[PDB]
Symmetry: D3
Subunit: 241 residues, 6 copies
């Protein structure tokens, strides 16, 4: 659930350090030498988003503070790991999401920009919003609201707008946009309810509702609300009974 997640990854790292000496020091530095998930995650995120403007060493303190303050940030990471492990047939190890999956890195990094944005650090948040778009190819406005148990499989090209809401247990694939229309401010982005699965390349535009457990077809363009448990596909999207 949480303690299980970190111990599954802890036990795995030991074995993978033995099988691949070239990464032994990486497994030790990232996983094996820390006492909890936050230690591994702040380390990995700091390194992936580093830049001389804001070096890993500086970034890590900012990340740790965030974790110390709102610990739930780490619980959500634990749940996201479990989601990928449970919904992605290609994933066979608990440590894989944590170490190599840019979609998962993008999500946890967004949790940091979301935290900064709500701590009155808009500049640093926009600066990291871009770092995240660059390092992971995922662009999430810091003010978007995203829950836990979320999976961004492959992730390249995902874009989530300012007023977006993604509830728990949502899965999103490469090239999917949750964007808006109009040159005005206010609610103009999608509300994706829990359990929703979005196919690769789908574009959901406007402040529209995406019912829970709905399935959105690859390359579908959703412009109108999608009932709960329904399947929308096509351009524009239609409900396929």
């Amino acid at each position: 659930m949480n303690l299980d997640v970190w111990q599954h990854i802890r036990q795995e790292a030991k074995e993978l350090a033995e099988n691949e000496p070239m990464l032994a020091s990486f497994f030790h530095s990232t996983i094996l030498k820390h006492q909890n998930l936050g230690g591994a995650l702040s380390y990995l995120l700091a390194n992936k988003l580093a830049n001389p403007i804001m070096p890993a060493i500086s970034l890590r303190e900012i990340i740790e503070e965030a974790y110390q303050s709102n610990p739930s940030i780490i619980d959500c990471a634990a749940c996201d790991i479990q989601a990928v492990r449970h919904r992605d047939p290609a994933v066979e190890l608990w440590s894989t999401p944590l170490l190599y999956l840019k979609g998962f890195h993008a999500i946890q990094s967004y949790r940091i920009t979301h935290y900064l944005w709500n701590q009155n650090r808009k500049s640093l948040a926009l600066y990291l919003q871009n770092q995240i778009s660059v390092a992971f190819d995922v662009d999430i406005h810091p003010a978007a609201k995203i829950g836990h148990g979320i999976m961004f499989d492959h992730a390249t090209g995902i874009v989530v707008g300012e007023t977006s809401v993604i509830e728990n247990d949502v899965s999103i694939l490469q090239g999917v946009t949750l964007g808006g229309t109009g040159k005005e401010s206010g609610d103009r982005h999608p509300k994706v309810r829990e359990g929703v699965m979005i196919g690769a390349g789908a574009k959901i535009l406007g402040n529209i509702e995406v019912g829970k457990y709905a399935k959105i077809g690859a390359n579908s363009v959703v412009l109108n609300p999608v009932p709960e448990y329904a399947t929308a596909a096509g351009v524009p999207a239609r409900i396929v009974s």
Copy 2:
């Protein structure tokens, strides 16, 4: 218009340096210590495209020379900033495009590869074409012709081909291609007239005309000309009266 743009950014940088000490030196080095937009832009672009093969320090001289020679390159950057400020509801600061928006960085970087390509420096231009695809996820052939007041919102996945033409005040989103068909050379890429807005994921193929102020739907595949002021949507794209 131009002098207003740089002074809006100059005044903003001072305030953001006060609110975020961690980036104070970044605001000063990039914006506050230079006398004009070109000083800030050449600095930022050099750093974002740096690589040991061609370091920021070396790149910057090449960029500055370009600016010195054809100053309009900087005016166009000023107009692009204003475009984003005016068409993107998420943007609230004039400095945001300049500092963090990879789409805007991609555009101005392309202006440099376009300049190099027309100075008989094809190698360096192809080398930077790739740097730009890597750093910003935007691939623009150096020979494409692009005007000013252009916005690449989010930008991940945009591709513009060799014979493409994009006129002024055009807005393009993530995943959009202006590509061609055929294994032959010659005109084989889109001509997008002024004011045109292209939705996320749209693919416009061939040497076809995209009338002014037309609107192209997300994920639309345009294979035939689109009349001025019209709206094309669907796969293939159809005119929605």
Copy 3:
């Protein structure tokens, strides 16, 4: 064919070193000082995928070993170069694919992760799978089976799944997915036969057959088998006689 490819690139590098002194040392270090394609390719790949966790110098030995062991890895690179030269109207030089095209870099890098994956080095392969998604925006599961004469033009956003098969002489563009459905393991990814051309943004889902020499339309969503020599387009994809 093979010896011709490396000599076309060798002769070109000399001329481009003369025309662009700023890259002279790059042409010499990458091309002119090595005796064969593997020398240039291992050098370039090591540098593009470097990271302190696994530096270029360390990566290069791993790459060289791979080449020494299975030399065909380099022949396939030679064929891929020729494919781009022959199918991409924008390419005018044999060295261009080798030096600047991220799609081609992604393919050859995948050949290394495929080799590592079959040498019982799953960790290192997943680590490089992510490096490749980051450096080139292309995500290829290491167990995918890909032949030679392959072209990933532009490439941003391409995703190839675990059980995928891509035969020879296949061309794939930006945003295309060869993905799967279901949370189960087993064959769940596309089988693209030889000669197949896939348009930008196409999403091919499931363990389905894509007949040889078929043409897939941009943004097409293929969910059912496509006969040989046929053209599929639309969402879902339909056969356009």
Copy 4:
């Protein structure tokens, strides 16, 4: 309390960031964002000693662990800063030692290797001993024993071997060696007692006592014990004079006959 020292630095830091925009983020990230000398110090040293083999971010954890086990390592740095501010006429700010003086950085970095040496991490301690010699040009064996209120002015070229001992309040200049003799292990390096000042280039060799409050002339070669309050000079060094009033480490009087 070593907080006064830190108070001075934090105070300088705010005004320094105000005057030099180009170093603002550096002052805030090293000094101002931290509430004690330990956070500044670990940050700085980890950055100066960084290498892909052991990156700044990794090394910093190792240093904070050492400060957690041995807080006195931080207080020792405070005093070392106080020693420089008082004895080095060139140093007017309390922040200068901390931010820029490589002899200071070296001594503090050594304290970290000294800690690892006895944590059963000798490979890492040797790795860092070398990182220190390369980064600051100072080679201090991790098993050496060094007190506090120590100044290594300029520092380039300083060598301090395995069995060396250096007590509190000693001033050492560039080029100085506290070297061993022989090809066997065991006590074979100098024991420099408090208040001793050693001039530039001086070489002290073997297991010999350098008397408290003694003064070692520049470029001398000391091979025999030196009496307290005595001044040794020459190649080889000879006891040329004696002052029982002087305080060589604090006076920094370089003249001798």
Copy 5:
């Protein structure tokens, strides 16, 4: 005109790029693409002194501003190159000093800190003073005064303190210190007049005049004034001989009795 010097370098550069393909882009980016010594020099120094705190690209602007305000800083480098080409038998090319000799880089880098020191940018000047000691192993206080036609051969270990003065045409070798004495500010460092050559390892301490055309023996310790055309040697140094014909900085005659 210091263009002759530059003409020689540019001429060597074209042929050097021709012979060593691996360094071509380095020769073009530093030398050939620039039309004067200033562009080459700022490029090189900014690269050698670079750090995430102050990256090459940022530092270079700071250097070009200094060259714009004080063009003589560039002409001083030309002469320093001429001094090495003439006095160092090991140096056959005019481009060698500029491209590779760390003592040269140090002196030029110091001139930049000297300029910042009086631009009200002492924090940056101290930051760089340290960057210089770390990059080239040479520690020159920014307030020191140094003329032109100066050679720091090998240079590792050279220290020049705050109130030091060095006139034109002086040759200084590795390990040399122009050091202070005392714990108080004020004139307390050596004043080395033209044509003086100082052998490796020599330590000159206090506010003392080192006579024009004098010759300082290696490893000596100078604590009293040295007469013009005199040769001082020993620990402590003694005036052992005098030659009124010699030109120590140019002859580089290291022998003494």
Copy 6:
């Protein structure tokens, strides 16, 4: 056979990786993955000497080419490691010299520049001569001739000029100069024969023979020939004593009268 030396290192390496997880990948990448000293050495040196101008990956090819043409360069390193393990009481592991001692790295790096110097690649050799002085603080002209079984303990500050010759089994400490004299090319640097040990800071200047098995006292200044088995000390150096039994390079006896 220099494989015994390598066997020791590989053996230490496995257990070292076992004890210090944080350095595991470093031990495997440098030592364990390679089957001979050449692969470890080229890897390490290329990494220590790396610069965007000549990156580790490029430089390494240049080094492997040198080892392919001149395998004895590797065997020379084996012996240099053996020399340190035997003479330096501080060094207990055979892997220490190889992994961490900058004087060792310098000597091996020089051997590469010496090879390039006569491959018609003098620009690259000078580029590296400087990379070596900056990375390890040791300046060895590429045209210098150095034997094997050589130890540069601590090494900071060592300078060895163009025409210098150093035979087998010599021990040299930090601050030592084998320097030239005069402003003309030609033989003008020391010739140090086997078994000679040179104390810290010593300066040997001009084309003079330093007799086999001789012992040079720390901080001495040698300007005249030194007889075999003789001990020279002082500024200027004088022959103070003679031992025909001693073996200075191996004994490392630093005391003198």
